[PDB]
Design a protein around this motif. Structure first.
Motif, PDB file in Angstrom:
ATOM      1  N   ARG A 197      -3.650   5.266  -4.421  1.00 62.24           N
ATOM      2  CA  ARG A 197      -4.244   5.222  -5.741  1.00 62.24           C
ATOM      3  C   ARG A 197      -4.714   3.850  -6.120  1.00 62.24           C
ATOM      4  O   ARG A 197      -5.670   3.719  -6.852  1.00 62.24           O
ATOM      5  CB  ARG A 197      -3.302   5.660  -6.845  1.00 62.24           C
ATOM      6  CG  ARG A 197      -3.004   7.135  -6.832  1.00 62.24           C
ATOM      7  CD  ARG A 197      -1.993   7.477  -7.881  1.00 62.24           C
ATOM      8  NE  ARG A 197      -2.542   7.122  -9.193  1.00 62.24           N
ATOM      9  CZ  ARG A 197      -1.836   6.647 -10.220  1.00 62.24           C
ATOM     10  NH1 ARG A 197      -0.512   6.457 -10.120  1.00 62.24           N
ATOM     11  NH2 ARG A 197      -2.444   6.332 -11.354  1.00 62.24           N
ATOM     12  N   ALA A 198      -3.998   2.836  -5.675  1.00 57.99           N
ATOM     13  CA  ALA A 198      -4.388   1.442  -6.007  1.00 57.99           C
ATOM     14  C   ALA A 198      -5.742   1.111  -5.360  1.00 57.99           C
ATOM     15  O   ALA A 198      -6.636   0.655  -6.092  1.00 57.99           O
ATOM     16  CB  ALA A 198      -3.339   0.442  -5.528  1.00 57.99           C
ATOM     17  N   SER A 199      -5.846   1.370  -4.056  1.00 54.73           N
ATOM     18  CA  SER A 199      -7.096   1.291  -3.279  1.00 54.73           C
ATOM     19  C   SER A 199      -8.311   2.038  -3.827  1.00 54.73           C
ATOM     20  O   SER A 199      -9.428   1.490  -3.797  1.00 54.73           O
ATOM     21  CB  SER A 199      -6.904   1.661  -1.829  1.00 54.73           C
ATOM     22  OG  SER A 199      -8.069   1.271  -1.094  1.00 54.73           O
ATOM     23  N   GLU A 200      -8.097   3.226  -4.378  1.00 52.67           N
ATOM     24  CA  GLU A 200      -9.170   4.025  -4.964  1.00 52.67           C
ATOM     25  C   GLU A 200      -9.616   3.403  -6.266  1.00 52.67           C
ATOM     26  O   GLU A 200     -10.761   3.569  -6.680  1.00 52.67           O
ATOM     27  CB  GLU A 200      -8.701   5.452  -5.288  1.00 52.67           C
ATOM     28  CG  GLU A 200      -8.269   6.233  -4.082  1.00 52.67           C
ATOM     29  CD  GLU A 200      -7.602   7.580  -4.430  1.00 52.67           C
ATOM     30  OE1 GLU A 200      -7.428   7.931  -5.628  1.00 52.67           O
ATOM     31  OE2 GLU A 200      -7.230   8.275  -3.472  1.00 52.67           O
ATOM     32  N   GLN A 201      -8.705   2.720  -6.965  1.00 52.05           N
ATOM     33  CA  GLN A 201      -9.098   1.924  -8.134  1.00 52.05           C
ATOM     34  C   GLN A 201      -9.653   0.533  -7.819  1.00 52.05           C
ATOM     35  O   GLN A 201      -9.898  -0.232  -8.742  1.00 52.05           O
ATOM     36  CB  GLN A 201      -7.924   1.754  -9.125  1.00 52.05           C
ATOM     37  CG  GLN A 201      -7.491   3.042  -9.773  1.00 52.05           C
ATOM     38  CD  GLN A 201      -6.436   2.820 -10.856  1.00 52.05           C
ATOM     39  OE1 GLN A 201      -6.677   2.077 -11.793  1.00 52.05           O
ATOM     40  NE2 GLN A 201      -5.311   3.449 -10.737  1.00 52.05           N
ATOM     41  N   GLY A 202      -9.861   0.210  -6.545  1.00 48.74           N
ATOM     42  CA  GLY A 202     -10.464  -1.048  -6.185  1.00 48.74           C
ATOM     43  C   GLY A 202      -9.527  -2.239  -6.041  1.00 48.74           C
ATOM     44  O   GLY A 202     -10.031  -3.378  -5.890  1.00 48.74           O
ATOM     45  N   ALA A 203      -8.212  -1.990  -6.040  1.00 45.86           N
ATOM     46  CA  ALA A 203      -7.246  -3.063  -5.895  1.00 45.86           C
ATOM     47  C   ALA A 203      -7.269  -3.508  -4.465  1.00 45.86           C
ATOM     48  O   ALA A 203      -7.416  -2.719  -3.557  1.00 45.86           O
ATOM     49  CB  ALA A 203      -5.855  -2.626  -6.343  1.00 45.86           C
ATOM     50  N   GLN A 204      -7.181  -4.796  -4.238  1.00 47.06           N
ATOM     51  CA  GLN A 204      -7.048  -5.347  -2.877  1.00 47.06           C
ATOM     52  C   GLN A 204      -5.609  -5.618  -2.427  1.00 47.06           C
ATOM     53  O   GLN A 204      -5.368  -5.926  -1.240  1.00 47.06           O
ATOM     54  CB  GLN A 204      -7.832  -6.690  -2.813  1.00 47.06           C
ATOM     55  CG  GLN A 204      -9.331  -6.451  -2.999  1.00 47.06           C
ATOM     56  CD  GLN A 204      -9.844  -6.818  -4.354  1.00 47.06           C
ATOM     57  OE1 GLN A 204      -9.522  -7.877  -4.923  1.00 47.06           O
ATOM     58  NE2 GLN A 204     -10.718  -5.960  -4.883  1.00 47.06           N
ATOM     59  N   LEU A 205      -4.674  -5.521  -3.365  1.00 44.68           N
ATOM     60  CA  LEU A 205      -3.257  -5.749  -3.038  1.00 44.68           C
ATOM     61  C   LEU A 205      -2.380  -4.932  -3.984  1.00 44.68           C
ATOM     62  O   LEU A 205      -2.656  -4.818  -5.216  1.00 44.68           O
ATOM     63  CB  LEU A 205      -2.941  -7.249  -3.083  1.00 44.68           C
ATOM     64  CG  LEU A 205      -1.490  -7.686  -2.779  1.00 44.68           C
ATOM     65  CD1 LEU A 205      -1.477  -9.075  -2.299  1.00 44.68           C
ATOM     66  CD2 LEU A 205      -0.574  -7.573  -4.010  1.00 44.68           C
ATOM     67  N   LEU A 206      -1.305  -4.411  -3.387  1.00 45.13           N
ATOM     68  CA  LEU A 206      -0.308  -3.663  -4.119  1.00 45.13           C
ATOM     69  C   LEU A 206       1.032  -4.338  -3.995  1.00 45.13           C
ATOM     70  O   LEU A 206       1.493  -4.600  -2.895  1.00 45.13           O
ATOM     71  CB  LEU A 206      -0.156  -2.218  -3.571  1.00 45.13           C
ATOM     72  CG  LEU A 206       1.003  -1.395  -4.206  1.00 45.13           C
ATOM     73  CD1 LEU A 206       0.810  -1.283  -5.674  1.00 45.13           C
ATOM     74  CD2 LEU A 206       1.153  -0.009  -3.576  1.00 45.13           C
ATOM     75  N   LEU A 207       1.633  -4.614  -5.125  1.00 42.08           N
ATOM     76  CA  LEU A 207       2.950  -5.210  -5.170  1.00 42.08           C
ATOM     77  C   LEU A 207       3.971  -4.143  -5.505  1.00 42.08           C
ATOM     78  O   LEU A 207       3.788  -3.459  -6.537  1.00 42.08           O
ATOM     79  CB  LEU A 207       3.033  -6.266  -6.279  1.00 42.08           C
ATOM     80  CG  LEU A 207       4.438  -6.882  -6.580  1.00 42.08           C
ATOM     81  CD1 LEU A 207       5.086  -7.525  -5.353  1.00 42.08           C
ATOM     82  CD2 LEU A 207       4.408  -7.851  -7.733  1.00 42.08           C
ATOM     83  N   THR A 208       5.020  -4.042  -4.676  1.00 44.64           N
ATOM     84  CA  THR A 208       6.103  -3.062  -4.863  1.00 44.64           C
ATOM     85  C   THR A 208       7.475  -3.683  -5.234  1.00 44.64           C
ATOM     86  O   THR A 208       7.739  -4.878  -4.963  1.00 44.64           O
ATOM     87  CB  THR A 208       6.211  -2.115  -3.635  1.00 44.64           C
ATOM     88  OG1 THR A 208       6.724  -2.785  -2.453  1.00 44.64           O
ATOM     89  CG2 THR A 208       4.834  -1.430  -3.342  1.00 44.64           C
ATOM     90  N   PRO A 209       8.381  -2.909  -5.861  1.00 42.53           N
ATOM     91  CA  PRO A 209       9.687  -3.525  -6.278  1.00 42.53           C
ATOM     92  C   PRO A 209      10.694  -3.855  -5.225  1.00 42.53           C
ATOM     93  O   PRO A 209      10.582  -3.536  -4.037  1.00 42.53           O
ATOM     94  CB  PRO A 209      10.256  -2.517  -7.335  1.00 42.53           C
ATOM     95  CG  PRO A 209       9.074  -1.619  -7.661  1.00 42.53           C
ATOM     96  CD  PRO A 209       8.310  -1.511  -6.332  1.00 42.53           C
ATOM     97  N   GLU A 210      11.716  -4.591  -5.663  1.00 40.78           N
ATOM     98  CA  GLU A 210      12.756  -5.041  -4.749  1.00 40.78           C
ATOM     99  C   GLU A 210      13.582  -3.912  -4.177  1.00 40.78           C
ATOM    100  O   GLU A 210      14.035  -3.072  -4.930  1.00 40.78           O
ATOM    101  CB  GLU A 210      13.727  -5.955  -5.495  1.00 40.78           C
ATOM    102  CG  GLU A 210      14.870  -6.494  -4.682  1.00 40.78           C
ATOM    103  CD  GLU A 210      15.847  -7.334  -5.468  1.00 40.78           C
ATOM    104  OE1 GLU A 210      16.408  -8.333  -4.906  1.00 40.78           O
ATOM    105  OE2 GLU A 210      16.078  -7.013  -6.666  1.00 40.78           O
TER     106      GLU A 210
END
Lengths: 262, 262
Positions: free
Chosen positions: A36-49
């Protein structure tokens, strides 16, 4: 929306509940978020600890082997290269259970890990029993046209840790986290000070809802150099997407004096 | 009001305009504030940075001699012992014009100076041209049943300076200041982080209104260990009076590592 003119970096942060000791479910969630992040044009996804295994330090130490950590790690590399997005995740380190730390890693959109960091400031007796603290300064590297760095959860609460990154040139500090107990002053007071006092942007991605005997706060946020949120979530799960726009404390600071007064 | 049960320390902060190069007018104002603070039951009055001569660095350096600094300093000691109140003030240091710094001093209610400190982080080229930076860590001392320390203006913007005091045991850090330019993030973002990140109370006393080519922000404030204002002023002049009630970052912090990463 459309990528704005005057912005060349679109980032995403995943805020969600994890299931303790269920990496298949947890990594499916990161995979979905990465799509979903990629389809919104994000180049990076940050995930939790510790998202992969859930935030359950003693159970990770008791029951999660290095092989199972390595398996999840391979699966996350595949998600990065399977969804075409840079990915920041946090799992246990790769050594044996009583030798490994809490780590954060950055992989590019191809599926290659560019940086790894071991959490230096462990939080409380369960974390300190389950993991070995890191001994190394945070890494800083060029990516997407700026200097990125990594820190994990409690780290960002120490101005010294953020200064350490910013002193090595960090401009965007990415922080996976797991904060519960309605501790509103971490994102509401400390985070914005860390950005202002170094003139940097910080991205902070938390768990939310019930997990592993706790209820996580959500409150995921990207704070820019003036200390204002560029975007933020509340308690509900979400995928925060934000565009980054394109006193000199770092120079003025008498480091020579301040290194001996700590 | 009446001194509350569960409080044994009443502090006051003077926020006002100073007149450049008019110490008689300026010290009369501190005298008045010291009287009024005492009548309200305050045991200590905190005054702003360089109030005696006004915030006019180049003119202080050009035209204020050590004799005239010493004269104002005697008059402030007399105010402390003349109004029965501990007093924190800031003047130039006692050496010659091109050798002295910006200082803060604490005198008790008898008229005896207990602590002095020279501002370590000077702000901008006029201040750096007019004054010599301090080289010493902030002092910490018992007074009124807690550990007090001193820092001046831009100092408190460096988490390292506040940590330095808190590492020596400071529980209340008193900060004379002179902040203009509608810089709302110093009291609104940094100050509260400094209190939370060290688990201390900070008192910050500013100029307000037009002085020496600038318009000062006011915004004087006392922030406790949870980062909330115990009391605050806006832009208007005022005498803030506040009663102090009676994660362990200071211990957890890996100082050994963080001293070499700055």
């Amino acid at each position: 929306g459309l990528v704005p003119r005057g912005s060349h970096m679109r980032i995403a942060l995943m805020q969600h509940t994890a299931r303790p000791l269920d990496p298949q479910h947890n990594l499916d969630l990161i995979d979905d978020a990465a799509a979903r992040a990629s389809e919104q044009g994000a180049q990076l996804l940050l995930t939790p600890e510790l998202f992969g295994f859930g935030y359950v330090p003693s159970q990770i130490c008791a029951q999660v082997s290095a092989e199972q950590v390595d398996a999840a790690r391979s699966r996350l590399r595949g998600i990065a290269r399977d969804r075409g997005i840079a990915l920041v995740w946090s799992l246990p380190g790769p050594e044996g259970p009583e030798q490994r730390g809490i780590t954060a890693e950055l992989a590019d959109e191809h599926g290659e890990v560019l940086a790894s960091y071991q959490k230096v400031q462990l939080y409380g007796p369960e974390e300190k029993a389950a993991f070995v603290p890191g001994e190394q300064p945070p890494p800083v590297l060029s990516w997407g046209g700026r200097q990125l760095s990594l820190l994990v959860a409690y780290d960002v609460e120490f101005p010294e840790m953020v200064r350490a990154a910013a002193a090595r040139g960090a401009q965007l500090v990415l922080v996976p986290t797991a904060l519960a107990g309605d501790e509103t002053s971490v994102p509401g007071i400390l985070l914005p000070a860390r950005a202002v006092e170094n003139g940097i942007t910080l991205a902070y991605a938390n768990h939310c809802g019930p997990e592993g005997g706790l209820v996580f706060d959500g409150g995921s946020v990207v704070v820019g150099p003036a200390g204002q949120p560029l975007g933020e979530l509340g308690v509900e799960p979400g995928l925060l997407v934000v565009d980054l726009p394109d006193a000199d404390y770092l120079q003025d600071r008498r480091a020579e004096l301040h290194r001996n007064w700590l």
